[PDB]
Design a protein around this nucleic acid. Structure first.
Lengths: 86, 136, 129, 80, 98, 25, 149
RNA sequence: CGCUGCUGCAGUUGAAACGCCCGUAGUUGGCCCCCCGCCGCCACGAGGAAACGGGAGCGCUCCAGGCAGGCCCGUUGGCCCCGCCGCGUGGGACCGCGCAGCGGGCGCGGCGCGCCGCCGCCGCAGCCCCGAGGAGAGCGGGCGGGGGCACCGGUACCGGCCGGGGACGGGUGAAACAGGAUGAUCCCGCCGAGACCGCCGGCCGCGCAGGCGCCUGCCAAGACCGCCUCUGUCAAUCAAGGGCGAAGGCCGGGGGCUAGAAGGCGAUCAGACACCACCGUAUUCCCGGCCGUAAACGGUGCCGCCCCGCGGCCGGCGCGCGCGUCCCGCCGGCCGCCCAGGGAAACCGGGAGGCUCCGGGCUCUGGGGGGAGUAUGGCCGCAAGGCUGAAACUUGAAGGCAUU
């Protein structure tokens, strides 16, 4: 138990860069996110892009390793401003 | 400075740590010098002269100060010692016992003899001064 | 923070004399400063000292006749053995006959000359010459 | 001039700060003031920052400021 | 020794000033140390102003002025005589002279 | 800048020395 | 000097020399103690209870008119704040900066002010715990602070 | 040798204030109660080996000595000193520190007492220092390039065009390599992209420092001020420990206009591979982490006190007056000049003053020049490297500030 928290599965294999990158992505993939609809931290991933709330029971499209993504958060915000204008 | 009736420990610690900062205390009490000194705490030591050599004078003086390369018996450490007085190198011959004593600068070098830390005092068991005055 | 009340009071007393003023006001009044001023007044170094009642920590107005050279506090209050009340005299003041070190003793806060006669030793509060 | 201490000038003391003075003292007072609707006098702080309402006209008579409270309705003066 | 209390800069109650460049040298110079002489001149020289003023067919148009803040680096300023090396006595003077 | 140039020279000797210790482990 | 800033300021309050009630003031100790008790019913903090007595009523100094300070009046009625108001007011501020921090992760300046405010809550709590004005069990954590407010 | 500094060193520039802020131990704590209980404290006791040291007497011929000697105090050989944190008694200023109700009676509680109870039993003024130019909290009122986040506008540079028109254009110290009838440069009409926030813009301001400047909207804060608001010392500095920290750099993505480490190049010059011209990769810029350094400066740690005038600016507040961004003050910040004072001077005087006349509190660091911020071990970092950190050895100066 120390630096390689979830990447201990790999063992002494695949090299440090891959394990460090995997530690960020795998932690995000295995994380629990807040349902936009039910506001409870029970959204988990079923497949890349498919995230399902285990309380709300709602499936939402999302980033492969995160419910929301940085490009997409920008897009919703631009769409609301542009929609308010038109 | 620390000014508390209960600050004696801090003041003692500061003196202990700060005392070593002065170079002369560190030479005297660290103990590195005692191991390093070719004469280990001794006033002087005996040795055999492997080579009679002359060390050129440092500027601005110009001279071939006469010196001997001596292997001290106690530590088997070879050293350079100046043979004092005029033309007294003649008494020294290589493969001859000699006694080497400090130059009075406590391991430092005196005047224009570069890197000479000691002077011969007795060659073949007879004092160099006596030979130059022709006493013996 | 204002740890030593005496030091602030006595530096103001000496700063006012150096410019040369007739009245000085000391911001904090302490019963020890009041005693210190009293010993100096009796010896004649200073005149009347008036303790205004702030109802908070109080103030002191000390009248200066101009005869005080240096008045100071030795901090920490150090412990002076009776066979050392003479050692302090030469290190701190000018001449044995002129000058007064105040030391607190079980008998009270008194000048060293008095303590030396009583054969008692206390804890030094400060030097007034 | 022989003006000295322990007995200092009142006018000179006012200009000096409340705590930087021989006796630290209030710089504020209470005001006897009379409203347009009600002629009874309400005693108010001179530096009230609280919302203060008249015992008569429903609207507050106190307007809070950085220093002395300003008033919105009729004004009396100098409490006695 | 410290030559100037100002330290050659007018920085007071600050740790950093916006960089500007010498107009001549192009050296980055903190805004406080720049020489900064503002100049208001005329679009054409006085020697040509008379002839241009006569030429204009407009009723009352003066030669329009050009406003530029020249900011110079220390070296650019001493070489181009914008500022002079003064004695320790006159170094203190602050009023614009001449 | 002889002090800044001495430090760089010291660093290019310490990195060489660190490499030499690594050859022998 | 300010505890957590290199700032020096003096904007204090100067209590009068007279510790005796003013002549114009007509409120008996019970009259103002009643106001203090009804102001506690509104839930107003003792800093506000003291201000309300000062401006709507004319009792500029409560201890002058009564014999005890606002919290002594409250403690006698057992109506004092369970958590002393000073700590509680710091705790409101800590949660308020923490709420803003939840939206913005790049306000390093805001985070810094939190460390200073939190440090006060710890310092005042240790004094309050030692005085026993706070139960010894009390611990200000941070994540659990939202519930504590 | 005050070159180790308790007395008693130094740290603006000679060597040396940690880049900043929080912070635990540690150290240090405003004022305050006359009366005692425990402290430390101090006084004097006992009791503790001589030698030695100091010292009484004594002519070993003097002497270094030695306790001798002279018909002799009970002839001498006295007396002082083991630093003793031990003890005994006294004092109780200073120094900390004490939460609990008392008191009467019963009562001779198993030779005297206290306990330990029990009874309101009517005897207690029964039971609160005050409110720090300490600190936190509050409310009010303005304040600012303080922070974040979204939105945005403006030219300029660069590129891609449409038109026009015609020989050179760049570049410089002078040039030269690049560019130009594939019509460049130049002018206009547009367009793309990415940076950047001009002039206003400062002895302005804000921020804990590093730092901070488009336009709008939002969010949380912050110092200052005013106060008859609250609390009642809740504090000061700080190893260990946490966070932050220009630029350059590194890592994983985005982006790529401008400059531009490297690279290449034309001119130089004996040679320049350098400066100067030109092209240009990393970089610059964004997001998520690292790094942990700067002449991170005021080369000046932090909290507190008094301290001499004359100014300017800045943010509050109040006073005067008819009355104006007027005037005088107050508080806080930024500053200039400065009488003393200090200093080796330079100078500093909102301190570097109140210091050989040397002692308000706390931390840090230095101890001639090098070797060397090296070696080695450690810790940390992806690395670069950071933090810690010698010695052998060498040397008579190195340095500060002034004056010709």
């Amino acid at each position: 138990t120390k630096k390689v928290g979830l990447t201990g599965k790999y063992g002494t294999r695949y090299g440090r860069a891959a394990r460090k990158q995997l530690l960020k992505i795998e932690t995000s993939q295995k994380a629990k996110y807040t349902c936009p609809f039910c506001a409870k931290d029970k959204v988990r991933r079923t497949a890349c892009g498919i995230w399902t709330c285990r309380s709300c029971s709602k499936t939402m499209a999302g980033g492969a390793y995160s419910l929301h993504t940085e490009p997409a958060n920008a897009a919703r915000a631009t769409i609301r401003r542009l929609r308010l204008a038109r | 400075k620390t000014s508390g009736l209960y600050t004696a420990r801090k003041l003692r610690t500061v003196r202990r740590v700060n005392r070593w900062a002065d170079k002369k205390y560190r030479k005297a009490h660290l103990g590195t010098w005692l191991k390093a000194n070719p004469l280990e705490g001794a006033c002087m030591a005996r040795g055999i002269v492997t080579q009679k050599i002359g060390i050129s004078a440092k500027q601005p003086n110009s001279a071939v100060r006469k010196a001997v390369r001596v292997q001290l018996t106690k530590n088997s450490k070879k050293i350079t010692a100046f043979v004092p007085r005029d033309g007294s190198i003649t008494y020294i011959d290589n493969n001859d016992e000699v006694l080497v004593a400090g130059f009075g600068r406590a391991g430092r070098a005196v005047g224009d003899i570069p890197g000479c830390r000691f002077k011969v005092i007795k060659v073949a068991g007879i004092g160099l001064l006596a030979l130059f005055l022709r006493k013996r | 923070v204002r740890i030593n009340v005496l030091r602030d009071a006595l530096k103001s007393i000496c700063n006012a004399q150096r410019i040369g003023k007739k009245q000085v006001i000391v911001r904090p009044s302490s019963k020890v400063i009041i005693e210190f001023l009293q010993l100096m007044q009796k010896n004649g170094y200073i005149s009347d000292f008036a303790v205004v009642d702030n109802h908070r920590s109080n103030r002191i107005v000390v009248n200066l006749i101009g005869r005080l050279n240096k008045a100071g506090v030795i901090s920490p209050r150090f412990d002076i053995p009776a066979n050392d009340i003479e050692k302090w005299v030469v290190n701190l003041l000018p001449s044995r006959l002129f000058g007064h070190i105040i030391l607190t003793t079980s008998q009270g806060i008194m000048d060293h000359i008095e303590a030396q006669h009583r054969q008692i030793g206390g804890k030094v509060i400060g030097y007034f010459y | 001039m022989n003006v000295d201490l322990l007995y200092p000038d009142p006018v000179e003391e006012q200009r000096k700060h409340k705590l930087k003075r021989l006796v630290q003292g209030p710089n504020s007072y209470f005001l006897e003031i009379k409203c347009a609707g009600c002629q009874d006098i309400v005693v108010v702080y001179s530096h009230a920052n609280t919302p203060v309402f008249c015992p008569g006209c429903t609207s507050q008579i106190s307007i809070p400021t950085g220093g002395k409270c300003a008033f919105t309705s009729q004004v009396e003066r100098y409490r006695q | 020794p410290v030559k100037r209390r100002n330290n050659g800069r007018s920085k007071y109650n600050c740790g950093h000033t916006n960089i500007v460049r010498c107009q001549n040298c192009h050296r980055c110079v903190p805004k406080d140390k720049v020489i900064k002489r503002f100049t208001i001149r005329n679009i054409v020289d006085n020697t040509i102003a008379d002839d241009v003023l006569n030429a204009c067919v407009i009723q009352g148009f003066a030669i329009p002025k050009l406003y530029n803040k020249v900011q110079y680096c220390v070296s650019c300023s001493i070489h181009n005589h914008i500022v002079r090396v003064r004695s320790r006595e006159d170094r203190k003077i602050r009023t614009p002279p001449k | 800048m002889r002090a800044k140039w001495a430090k760089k020279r010291m660093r290019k000797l310490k990195r060489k020395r660190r490499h030499m210790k690594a050859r022998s482990k | 000097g300010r505890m957590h800033s290199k700032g020096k300021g003096i904007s204090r309050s100067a209590i009068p020399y007279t510790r005796a009630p003013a002549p114009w003031n007509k409120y008996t100790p019970e009259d103002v103690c009643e106001q203090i008790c009804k102001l506690a019913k509104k839930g107003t903090p003792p800093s506000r209870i003291g201000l309300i007595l000062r401006d709507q009523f004319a009792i500029g100094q409560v201890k002058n008119v009564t014999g005890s300070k606002i919290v002594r009046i409250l403690k006698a009625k057992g109506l004092a704040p369970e958590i002393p108001e000073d700590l509680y007011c710091m705790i409101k501020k800590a949660v308020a900066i923490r709420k803003h921090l939840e939206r913005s992760r790049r306000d390093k300046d805001s985070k810094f002010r939190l460390i200073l405010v939190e440090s006060r809550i710890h310092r005042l709590a240790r004094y309050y715990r030692q005085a026993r004005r706070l139960p010894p069990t009390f611990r200000y954590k941070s994540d659990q602070a939202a519930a504590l407010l």
